Amino acid sequence: GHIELASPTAHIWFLKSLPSRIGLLLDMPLRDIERVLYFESYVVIEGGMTNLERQQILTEEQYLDALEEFGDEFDAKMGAEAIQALLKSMDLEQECEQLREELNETNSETKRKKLTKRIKLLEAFVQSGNKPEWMILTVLPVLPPDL
Amino acid sequence: GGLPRVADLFEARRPKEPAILAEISGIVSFGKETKGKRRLVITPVDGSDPYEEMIPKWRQLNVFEGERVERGDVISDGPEAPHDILRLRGVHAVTRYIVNEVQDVYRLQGVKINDKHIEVIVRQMLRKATIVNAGSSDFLEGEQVEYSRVKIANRELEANGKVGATYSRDLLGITKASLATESFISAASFQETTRVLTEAAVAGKRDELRGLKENVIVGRLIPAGTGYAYHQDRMRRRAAG
Amino acid sequence: SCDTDFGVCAHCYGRDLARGHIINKGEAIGVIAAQSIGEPGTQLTM
Amino acid sequence: AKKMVEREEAVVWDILDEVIREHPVLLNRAPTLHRLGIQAFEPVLIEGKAIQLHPLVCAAYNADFDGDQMAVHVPLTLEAQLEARALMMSTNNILSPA
Amino acid sequence: LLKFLKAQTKTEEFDAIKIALASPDMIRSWSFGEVKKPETINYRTFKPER
Amino acid sequence: VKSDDVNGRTKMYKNIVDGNHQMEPGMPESFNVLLKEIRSLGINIELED
Amino acid sequence: ARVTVQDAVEKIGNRFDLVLVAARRARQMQVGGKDPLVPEENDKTTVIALREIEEGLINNQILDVRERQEQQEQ
RNA sequence: GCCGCG
DNA sequence: AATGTGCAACAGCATGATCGCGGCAAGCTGATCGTGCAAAAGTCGTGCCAGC
Numbered sequence: 082g083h084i085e086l087a088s089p090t091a092h093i094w095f096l097k098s099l100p101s102r103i104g105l106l107l108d109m110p111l112r113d114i115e116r117v118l119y120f121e122s123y124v125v126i127e128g129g130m131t132n133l134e135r136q137q138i139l140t141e142e143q144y145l146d147a148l149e150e151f152g153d154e155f156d157a158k159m160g161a162e163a164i165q166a167l168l169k170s171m172d173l174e175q176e177c178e179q180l181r182e183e184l185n186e187t188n189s190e191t192k193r194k195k196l197t198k199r200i201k202l203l204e205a206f207v208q209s210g211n212k213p214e215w216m217i218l219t220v221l222p223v224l225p226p227d228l
Numbered sequence: 229g230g231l232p233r234v235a236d237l238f239e240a241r242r243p244k245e246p247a248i249l250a251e252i253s254g255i256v257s258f259g260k261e262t263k264g265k266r267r268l269v270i271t272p273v274d275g276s277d278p279y280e281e282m283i284p285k286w287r288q289l290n291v292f293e294g295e296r297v298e299r300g301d302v303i304s305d306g307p308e309a310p311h312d313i314l315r316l317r318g319v320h321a322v323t324r325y326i327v328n329e330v331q332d333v334y335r336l337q338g339v340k341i342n343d344k345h346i347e348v349i350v351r352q353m354l355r356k357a358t359i360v361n362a363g364s365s366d367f368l369e370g371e372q373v374e375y376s377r378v379k380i381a382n383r384e385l386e387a388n389g390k391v392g393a394t395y396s397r398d399l400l401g402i403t404k405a406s407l408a409t410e411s412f413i414s415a416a417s418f419q420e421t422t423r424v425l426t427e428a429a430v431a432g433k434r435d436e437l438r439g440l441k442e443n444v445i446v447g448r449l450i451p452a453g454t455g456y457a458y459h460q461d462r463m464r465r466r467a468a469g
Numbered sequence: 470s471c472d473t474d475f476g477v478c479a480h481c482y483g484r485d486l487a488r489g490h491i492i493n494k495g496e497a498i499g500v501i502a503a504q505s506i507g508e509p510g511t512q513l514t515m
Numbered sequence: 516a517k518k519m520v521e522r523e524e525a526v527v528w529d530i531l532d533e534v535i536r537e538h539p540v541l542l543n544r545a546p547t548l549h550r551l552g553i554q555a556f557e558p559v560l561i562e563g564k565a566i567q568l569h570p571l572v573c574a575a576y577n578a579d580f581d582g583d584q585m586a587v588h589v590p591l592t593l594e595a596q597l598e599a600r601a602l603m604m605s606t607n608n609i610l611s612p613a
Numbered sequence: 614l615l616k617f618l619k620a621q622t623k624t625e626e627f628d629a630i631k632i633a634l635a636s637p638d639m640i641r642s643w644s645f646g647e648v649k650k651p652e653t654i655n656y657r658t659f660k661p662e663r
Numbered sequence: 664v665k666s667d668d669v670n671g672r673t674k675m676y677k678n679i680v681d682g683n684h685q686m687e688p689g690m691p692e693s694f695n696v697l698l699k700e701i702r703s704l705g706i707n708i709e710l711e712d
Numbered sequence: 713a714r715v716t717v718q719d720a721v722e723k724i725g726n727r728f729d730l731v732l733v734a735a736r737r738a739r740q741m742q743v744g745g746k747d748p749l750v751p752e753e754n755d756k757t758t759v760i761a762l763r764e765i766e767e768g769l770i771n772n773q774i775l776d777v778r779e780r781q782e783q784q785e786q
Numbered sequence: 787g788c789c790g791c792g
Numbered sequence: 793a794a795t796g797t798g799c800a801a802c803a804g805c806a807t808g809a810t811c812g813c814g815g816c817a818a819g820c821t822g823a824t825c826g827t828g829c830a831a832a833a834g835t836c837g838t839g840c841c842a843g844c
């Protein structure tokens with residue numbers, strides 16, 4: 082059996098563990114994703130015409146200022162649908178190549194370990210055939226009654 | 229002392245004050261521009277490629293002169309971590325260290341245990357070498373020595389011998405050596421299962437049921453003892469198709 | 470230093486202490502070693 | 516057969532004595548520290564309620580007779596019987612493998 | 614369509630168990646239905662709910 | 664056979680009463696339960712061939 | 713009765729293989745279609761097969777040749 | 787949850 | 793001579809801390825309303841023929 086959630090939700094298994102898989106896949110700290118996943122702050126996507134970045138952690142007041150100034154072109158949302166949208170748009174091979182070039186061009190011990198961890202995770206995802214959009218779960222299974 | 233030390237030895241924990249070691253030729257260098265940071269920066273040229281070490285000056289320096297200090301020498305007094313022993317003095321040196329220090333705990337009380345049973349445990353702590361050269365699809369990552377040995381054997385056999393990449397062996401405690409094995413069914417039944425399944429689920433790996441706990445869990449014949457003979461028959465059929 | 474893959478040579482490992490002869494192929498020596506090291510400890514004065 | 520065993524006639528006792536003949540059962544003590552903590556013995560039927568243990572093996576079990584209890588398991592297979600007879604018998608493990 | 618055994622054939626040869634993330638379509642594939650009502654058992658007839 | 668194999672129990676009992684002393688092992692129910700518990704998470708685990 | 717299985721162990725030396733050989737022989741004698749080659753002292757099939765191995769008249773190779781002979785006969 | 791047994 | 797970068801110390805959080813066995817009570821405690829209507833299903837008071 083199964084449950085249709087009618088609203089995307091995140092998997093605590095991967096979101097909340099010390100080497101957060103989704104957190105370092107997004108290359109952003111755990112606190113920002115935790116705040117956006119519980120509707121404390123928004124996150125924007127695209128908006129190239131406006132000054133907003135690709136991964137802004139703009140809050141409600143910043144959102145009001147943006148919609149008063151920028152108006153349109155601000156695709157900002159808060160729910161797990163936000164992580165949906167920003168995870169589907171991510172390109173695996175291009176990001177892996179860009180990060181590999183960044184790691185090989187600049188030598189620094191502090192960033193080298195994080196870069197290698199990110200490369201390892203990305204390569205594992207592209208090789209296993211999984212889709213990173215599957216971290217969060219749209220449909221939730223249920224156990225058999227006799228168990 | 230005591231025997232929160234057979235635990236302390238097997239996990240290979242770094243002690244409070246490790247003793248520093250040196251390299252091939254320890255010429256007199258003292259310290260150049262010893263500022264308020266770690267002073268007495270020793271820079272032995274050793275002909276080429278000098279090694280710059282930093283000491284916080286809170287620990288005395290032993291060898292004032294050169295005396296042609298070789299690798300593994302005691303630059304400063306103190307207990308030695310097993311990791312330093314393995315990196316510099318060799319694999320046989322760390323085995324004699326752990327065996328002698330563990331047996332000291334048992335001998336002092338009056339317990340007889342053969343040295344064979346400690347070298348077996350140490351052998352399971354000396355897996356997973358770190359690769360430092362490339363060309364064989366590996367570059368600066370920790371892989372099992374068994375896989376590193378077979379990769380070298382095939383690469384050396386072929387004409388392109390230079391592809392074979394040397395490694396730097398690594399030492400892991402018992403609690404960290406068991407959780408990192410290639411079978412995810414094992415190491416999920418012993419310590420943190422939330423972390424082990426999460427990294428196995430993402431990587432999409434398989435177990436292949438090669439050990440003892442994997443076969444015990446699924447109710448098959450273990451590959452040891454009277455079940456060893458049966459497991460060999462299955463292996464040859466798999467290779468033959 | 471047995472250098473064999475996924476196991477240990479019957480010659481690199483000595484004779485099994487339980488019986489006088491050399492060890493036979495297929496004897497699970499890891500569990501035996503772990504039990505031998507861990508059977509004491511209840512008599513180590515910590 | 517079930518009713519006859521329930522009523523436990525004398526012939527049931529004779530047949531029980533017959534099936535016990537060369538069927539080793541294996542005993543273990545609670546803190547099975549090493550592998551000598553579980554050993555296979557040939558049973559001898561006794562009139563009582565307490566298991567009788569050979570004194571010599573006690574040092575292997577770390578067992579004293581001051582309220583200790585032991586568990587009995589029956590290896591109900593041909594292969595298991597040969598394994599108990601040729602690997603777990605008290606006459607097989609004389610030296611400690613440590 | 615008789616003389617069928619399903620418990621015996623339920624045991625199939627296997628080796629090398631594998632693990633990976635579960636896609637939503639695969640989750641639908643496992644399921645034999647969708648639950649919408651939370652009720653566990655009713656007492657009017659002592660039967661599982663629809 | 665002794666504990667978890669649901670059909671192994673009955674087969675072993677019938678073999679003993681017959682006088683066969685044959686194992687005919689199988690698949691422990693505990694591992695099927697564990698597979699269902701893992702699958703009830705967001706994780707897919709299966710038996711490959 | 714075999715109190716100790718040392719003789720069978722030196723006859724075919726593994727301490728692990730004679731369990732399999734004796735299990736096969738005991739199965740042959742217990743399921744049916746075979747009779748002991750050693751006098752029977754009302755023992756079980758287990759120690760009977762062990763005695764047969766100890767006497768040196770049963771091992772893996774000759775068991776295989778007897779199986780082949782039976783197959784060729786039919 | 788408590789108590790005891792080796 | 794003012795400035796940016798990499799390294800190290802301190803705080804917070806995750807994890808695990810023996811194996812069997814026996815006996816006794818108390819919790820184990822546990823509910824989403826009504827809705828008011830067709831639509832269906834069932835039921836009851838009544839009359840029917842067939843057997844003695």
Ligand SMILES: [Mg+2]
Pocket residue numbers: 578579580581582583792
């Ligand atoms: Mg006692």
Ligand SMILES: [Zn+2]
Pocket residue numbers: 470471472473477478479480481482
């Ligand atoms: Zn060897």
